[PDB]
Amino acid sequence: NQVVQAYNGDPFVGHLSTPISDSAFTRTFIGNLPAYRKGLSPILRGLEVGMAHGYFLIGPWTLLGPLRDSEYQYIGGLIGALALILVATAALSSYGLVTFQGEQGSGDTLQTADGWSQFAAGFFVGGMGGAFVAYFLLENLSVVDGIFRGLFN
Amino acid sequence: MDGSYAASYLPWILIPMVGWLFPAVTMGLLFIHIESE
């Protein structure tokens, strides 16, 4: 009833097949994230990765920021999130320029210069879009509260 | 929909999730599943 085998039946690779690293749920979940999902073009997986992080980065400066005790509470959070997504996409494109210069194959469409460039473009679009949509929900928070409770219905 | 009871924000977040996220996620996963291979 052993639950920790070696990774993929290979006992000399440096990995164990633990219930977290190599379970069925982990295979179906980690293997279906945009970074690992099958058949996607790099632009759509970069777009889906980007929105999940733009929507995330709005919060930390919105609730904990130099502007959190003023009337421009959400604008400061949005400005910080755009700064972070800008430097994130600059880092992503610099990584693409650096890593993928020697010619490699096309076994994975993401680990190539065109693929990583598409991933960086999608990450930028998704990140700034997610940041602005979280800003738009937060700025119009009275509206969202009223429509979820039924103050206008 | 005011909530007099304890944790009135909890239905505020759980009616969208059980109404949309649970159906959209469950039908999305089942649509990938019943049509796989």
Partner: peptide
């Protein structure tokens, strides 16, 4: 009445039948 944190305590307790129901249903699927 009832407390605010008793409801969240009930939710995090019921997270355990969620995990065990998921694993039982997965094991029935075999």
């Amino acid at each position: 009445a009832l407390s605010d944190t008793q409801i969240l305590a009930a939710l995090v307790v019921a997270l355990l039948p969620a995990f065990l129901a998921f694993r039982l249903s997965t094991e029935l699927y075999k």
